[PDB]
Design an enzyme around this catalytic site. Structure first.
Site, PDB file in Angstrom:
ATOM      1  N   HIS A  45      17.511 -11.640 -53.508  1.00 39.35           N
ATOM      2  CA  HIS A  45      17.709 -11.476 -51.690  1.00 39.35           C
ATOM      3  C   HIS A  45      17.519 -13.452 -51.345  1.00 39.35           C
ATOM      4  O   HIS A  45      17.677 -13.487 -50.391  1.00 39.35           O
ATOM      5  CB  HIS A  45      17.145 -10.649 -51.221  1.00 39.35           C
ATOM      6  CG  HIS A  45      15.380 -11.174 -51.038  1.00 39.35           C
ATOM      7  ND1 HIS A  45      14.195 -10.019 -52.185  1.00 39.35           N
ATOM      8  CD2 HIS A  45      15.041 -11.973 -49.987  1.00 39.35           C
ATOM      9  CE1 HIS A  45      13.610 -10.755 -51.481  1.00 39.35           C
ATOM     10  NE2 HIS A  45      13.681 -11.490 -50.278  1.00 39.35           N
ATOM     11  N   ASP A  89      17.096  -6.537 -57.744  1.00 37.36           N
ATOM     12  CA  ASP A  89      16.492  -7.595 -56.662  1.00 37.36           C
ATOM     13  C   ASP A  89      15.577  -8.499 -58.130  1.00 37.36           C
ATOM     14  O   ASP A  89      14.634  -9.011 -57.593  1.00 37.36           O
ATOM     15  CB  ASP A  89      15.587  -7.215 -55.571  1.00 37.36           C
ATOM     16  CG  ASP A  89      15.475  -8.624 -54.846  1.00 37.36           C
ATOM     17  OD1 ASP A  89      16.301  -9.347 -54.547  1.00 37.36           O
ATOM     18  OD2 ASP A  89      14.545  -8.160 -53.667  1.00 37.36           O
ATOM     19  N   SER A 182       8.716 -13.587 -50.737  1.00 36.92           N
ATOM     20  CA  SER A 182       9.725 -13.086 -51.261  1.00 36.92           C
ATOM     21  C   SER A 182      10.159 -13.453 -52.466  1.00 36.92           C
ATOM     22  O   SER A 182       9.747 -15.144 -52.545  1.00 36.92           O
ATOM     23  CB  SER A 182      11.740 -13.170 -50.485  1.00 36.92           C
ATOM     24  OG  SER A 182      11.014 -12.609 -49.481  1.00 36.92           O
TER      25      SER A 182
HETATM   26  C1  LIG Z   1      15.600 -14.650 -47.724  1.00 40.74           C
HETATM   27  O1  LIG Z   1      15.580 -13.046 -46.469  1.00 40.74           O
HETATM   28  C2  LIG Z   1      16.419 -12.592 -46.261  1.00 40.74           C
HETATM   29  C3  LIG Z   1      16.088 -11.453 -45.756  1.00 40.74           C
HETATM   30  N1  LIG Z   1      15.248 -10.634 -46.257  1.00 40.74           N
HETATM   31  C4  LIG Z   1      13.693 -10.911 -46.137  1.00 40.74           C
HETATM   32  C5  LIG Z   1      13.014 -11.245 -44.635  1.00 40.74           C
HETATM   33  O2  LIG Z   1      12.313 -12.557 -45.114  1.00 40.74           O
HETATM   34  O3  LIG Z   1      13.565 -11.523 -43.647  1.00 40.74           O
HETATM   35  C6  LIG Z   1      13.361 -10.181 -46.846  1.00 40.74           C
HETATM   36  C7  LIG Z   1      11.561 -10.322 -47.001  1.00 40.74           C
HETATM   37  C8  LIG Z   1      11.344  -8.903 -46.608  1.00 40.74           C
HETATM   38  C9  LIG Z   1      11.166  -8.773 -45.298  1.00 40.74           C
HETATM   39  C10 LIG Z   1      10.793  -8.009 -44.888  1.00 40.74           C
HETATM   40  C11 LIG Z   1       9.641  -7.387 -44.956  1.00 40.74           C
HETATM   41  C12 LIG Z   1       8.941  -7.810 -45.822  1.00 40.74           C
HETATM   42  C13 LIG Z   1       6.921  -7.854 -46.541  1.00 40.74           C
HETATM   43  C14 LIG Z   1       7.201  -7.914 -47.831  1.00 40.74           C
HETATM   44  C15 LIG Z   1       7.619  -8.915 -48.372  1.00 40.74           C
HETATM   45  C16 LIG Z   1       9.284  -8.690 -48.052  1.00 40.74           C
HETATM   46  C17 LIG Z   1       9.469  -8.591 -47.362  1.00 40.74           C
HETATM   47  C18 LIG Z   1      13.931  -9.840 -47.627  1.00 40.74           C
HETATM   48  C19 LIG Z   1      14.423  -8.269 -48.651  1.00 40.74           C
HETATM   49  C20 LIG Z   1      15.512  -7.685 -48.368  1.00 40.74           C
HETATM   50  C21 LIG Z   1      16.641  -8.807 -48.368  1.00 40.74           C
HETATM   51  C22 LIG Z   1      16.745  -9.303 -47.328  1.00 40.74           C
HETATM   52  C23 LIG Z   1      15.660 -10.130 -47.187  1.00 40.74           C
END
Ligand SMILES: COCCn1c(C(=O)O)c(Cc2cccc3ccccc23)c2ccccc21
Ligand SMILES: [Zn+2]
Length: 226
Positions: A45, A89, A182
């Site tokens: 991601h 992922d 991430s």
């Molecule tokens: C790179 O971002 C694109 C958008 N995005 C983001 C983000 O940071 O918004 C995350 C990571 C994430 C989101 C929500 C809560 C979490 C809690 C712990 C760790 C990670 C979390 C993510 C994962 C899969 C797909 C898209 C994603």
């Protein structure tokens, strides 16, 4: 990282700070880790149109001689990565050139053994991610010790799968990986076993990590072919 400590500077020399470009929005950021001099492992991601990697960082706002800013020449996103379920992922980044080995920059190769890691133990995760729901990404590398949980603790993530993913962080604590962490490694006794994947918007643990053992064949396939 929520509820963690500041890493001793340069104490995790494999950590990578990723700046990810997309065509239709500003830069986004992820972590990752150097597994070969020219390969960084991270989350799928975190893919984008192009990526820069900074190795050797502690305070990512303060340039220093330890920094190596390296171009990524190709992204290898897992071919079955699913944006709905978030299965698979995982992504490898090939760097244009091999990084220099310094005190502050080194690889974290996988051991031969790829044994399935059961629930119960404590592992550590590091990142420059947000330190709270309403808090920007940390300028300094942060880290936190988290409990591997039984898979039922992650049942509320309806697409969680125990075979594919680790369930990480005692729900009784605030301690957690979060947004911006991430792609960073979860190390259990010094061995990378997980990759930060996703969790709740409200940061209540546990969060979901990619289970590296499952992807060891794929990782090897990409590395051997490139
Ligand atoms: C790179 O971002 C694109 C958008 N995005 C983001 C983000 O940071 O918004 C995350 C990571 C994430 C989101 C929500 C809560 C979490 C809690 C712990 C760790 C990670 C979390 C993510 C994962 C899969 C797909 C898209 C994603
Ligand atoms: Zn330094």
């Amino acid at each position: 990282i929520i509820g963690g400590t500041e890493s001793k500077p340069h104490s995790r020399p494999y950590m990578a700070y990723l700046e990810i470009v997309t065509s239709n929005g500003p830069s986004k950021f992820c972590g990752g880790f150097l597994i070969r001099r020219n390969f960084v492992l991270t989350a799928a991601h975190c893919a984008g149109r192009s990526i820069t990697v900074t190795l050797g960082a502690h305070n990512i706002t303060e340039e220093e001689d330890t920094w190596q800013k390296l171009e990524v020449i190709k992204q290898f996103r897992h071919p079955k990565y699913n944006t709905s379920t978030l299965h698979h992922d995982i992504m490898l980044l090939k760097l244009k050139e091999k990084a220099s080995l310094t005190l502050a920059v080194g690889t974290l190769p996988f051991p031969s053994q790829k044994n399935f890691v059961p629930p119960g133990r404590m592992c550590r995760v590091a990142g420059w991610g947000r330190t709270g729901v309403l808090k920007p990404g940390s300028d300094t590398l942060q880290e936190v010790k988290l409990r591997l949980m039984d898979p039922q603790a992650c049942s509320h993530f309806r697409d969680f799968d125990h075979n594919l993913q680790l369930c990480v962080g005692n729900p009784r604590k605030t301690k957690s990986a979060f947004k911006g962490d991430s792609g960073g490694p979860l190390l259990c006794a010094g061995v990378a076993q997980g990759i930060v994947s996703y969790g709740r918007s409200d940061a209540k643990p546990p969060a979901v990590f990619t289970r590296i053992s499952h992807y060891r064949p794929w990782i090897n396939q990409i590395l051997q072919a490139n």
